Structure formats: structure tokens, C-alpha cells
Amino acid sequence: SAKDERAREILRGFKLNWMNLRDAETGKILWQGTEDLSVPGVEHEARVPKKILKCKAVSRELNFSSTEQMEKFRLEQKVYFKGQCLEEWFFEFGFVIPNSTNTWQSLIEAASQMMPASVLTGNVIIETKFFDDDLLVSTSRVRLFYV
Ligand SMILES: c1ccc([C@@H]2Nc3ccccc3-c3nc4ccccc4n32)nc1
Ligand SMILES: c1ccc([C@@H]2Nc3ccccc3-c3nc4ccccc4n32)nc1
């Protein structure tokens, strides 16, 4: 369909350039990277400090480029533990200018009692879906290790 084709054009023009995660209370950077963890079809991996699980909230900065215009760029993310969804998060960025580069800041609040890092590590998958409005542009997964 015309929509399948537009989703592929948007994905072809998209890159996640860099990202970081901070403790929202202190501001300190807990994780950073420059690889595009949203590329579909391969399982990505990330190692995060275990103490991130004790944060009341984490702030994310996500820097991305897009050749295509988007009217309502947004994300749906699911935290899966051994295949079961524990939490779902929704975030909206909105309009994206064609051929722009953009930094998107989001706050992720903890929900309700966290299992220990040693039980979670290697058993959490974050599934990220990027949309333009109701159009699914890509689905990607990162497996998390807590260190
Ligand atoms: C390190 C850790 C988790 C991710 C994961 N995976 C992601 C992949 C593409 C874009 C954003 C993320 C991301 N946002 C997160 C917010 C809270 C917890 C995990 C989150 N992710 N990426 C790198
Ligand atoms: C604050 C906000 C969200 C979470 C969230 N909450 C989680 C709930 C169940 C399993 C894993 C997580 C989780 N892994 C994370 C890796 C990086 C950042 C946040 C992460 N989480 N933890 C503290």
C-alpha cells in the first residue's frame, strides 16, 4: 500500500545519532551511546548501571535526523521480562521538519516494586516502536544487562 511505501521511505531517511540516559534527580549521565539502537531486525544489547533501577525517574535525550517530514512522530515502548510485558510507555515528539536533526528530551517515571538487577539482567527486552501518527515506521529491540 501507499502507507507501507511511505513507512519505508521514512525509515530509509531516519537515523538515531546518539542517546543518553540520566538520573532525573541528580542530572548525572548513567548511560550514553552513539549507535543507532533502533535499527530493526537485529537484537541490540546495552549494559546499564544497575543503580538506574533505583531512580525515581530517568531523563532521556535522543538525537535523530530525518530526511522525511513527519506530522506526529511518536514512540511506544514496552518493557518485556522473559517475554511478558511489565510496563508500556508513550512519548510524542510531533512535527518533524524534512532534513532536520533534532534532540528529544523525555522523562520516564518508575511505576510497582522492582525485581533485583541480578534477576532482570539479560532477561529484559525494551521493544521500541516509532510511528508517524498511526503509521508504524520501525520496530526494534534492545536486550538489557544491569552491571
Ligand atoms: C540503553 C538502555 C535502554 C535502551 C532502550 N532502547 C531504546 C532504543 C531506541 C530509543 C530509545 C531507547 C530507550 N529509551 C529508554 C528509556 C528507559 C529505559 C530504556 C530505554 N531504551 N537503550 C540504551
Ligand atoms: C526509572 C524509570 C524506569 C525504570 C525502568 N523500569 C523497569 C521495570 C522493570 C524492568 C526493567 C526496568 C527498567 N530498566 C531500565 C534501564 C534503563 C532505564 C530505566 C529502566 N527501567 N527504572 C527506573
Domain boundaries defined on the chain: 1-147
Q: Tell me how far the alpha carbon of residue 126 lies from the centroid of ligand 1, in angstroms.
A: 7
Answer for the pair 87, 79: CB distance below 8 angstroms, yes or no.
yes
Give CATH for domain 1-147: 2.70.50.40
Q: Is 38 in the pocket of ligand 1 (CB under 6 A)?
A: yes
> Angle CA(80)–CA(65)–CA(56) in degrees, nearest 5?
40
- Residue pair 116/50 in contact by the 8 Å Cβ criterion: no
User: If you take atom 14 of ligand 1, which residue's CA is the nearest one?
Assistant: 60
Task: Please give the helix or strand (H or E) that residue 117 lies within, else none.
Answer: helix 117-120
Closest CA to 133 of 67, 76, 62: 76
| Best mutation site among 19, 52, 54 for ligand 2 pocket (most ligand atoms within 8 Å of CB) | 52
Solved by what technique?
X-ray
State how far the Cα of 125 lies from the Cα of 127, in Å rounded to an integer: 6
**Residue 31 near ligand 1, beta carbon < 6 Å:** yes
- Decide if 117 contacts 146 (C-beta within 8 A): yes
What size, in residues, is the chain? 147
